[PDB]
Amino acid sequence: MASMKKKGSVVIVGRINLSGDTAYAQQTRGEEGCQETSQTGRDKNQVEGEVQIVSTATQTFLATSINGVLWTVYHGAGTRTIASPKGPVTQMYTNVDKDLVGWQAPQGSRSLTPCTCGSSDLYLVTRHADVIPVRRRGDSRGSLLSPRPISYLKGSAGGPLLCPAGHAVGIFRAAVSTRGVAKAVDFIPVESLETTMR
């Protein structure tokens, strides 16, 4: 009992900057700082933007603010707290069945708005800051116009699928792969987030 350890907090380590004409990844914290911040849960950095890059001790992935909640995947974050200026913040939503977790959006973040367009031409924002067209194929599936190796999509779970008007259509969670080639993606539709919130 005396030597039992605790899991650290999820730590924001950067963002996918979508503020201008060019999408690009920015790092805001390096490895040592990330490790320290994960243990204290105290992160005094100013947060900006809609899509954060987040890390645990073992994975780096994405998290997206939609309607004042910072959302990511359960398979990345588990039940972990997130580091914040006031210390660790407990999850507000946890749903292993949807592969979905959420925390109150950090002050300074900007939130996307859920899509009401009912459109099927979508765009996936990756951890490498590419914006890839995705044709919607079902409630939770879309096809990549150009296939990619799965290596390329690893670390992008928690990132958004957007409509042409820039609304949030879903949260990316898993590649649909054959022999290492992703031709499609599985995502959590924004309507499922909306149900969770209401």
């Binding site: 992935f61 995947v73 398979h75 592969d99 799965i150 999509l153 690893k154 670390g155 992008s156 779970a157 990316f172 969670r173 898993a174 590649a175 649909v176 792969s177 054959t178 992703a182 031709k183 499609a184 599985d186």
Partner: peptide, 7 residues
């Protein structure tokens, strides 16, 4: 066969 790979 296609499989889901969590990312």
């Amino acid at each position: 066969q296609e499989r889901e790979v969590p990312c």
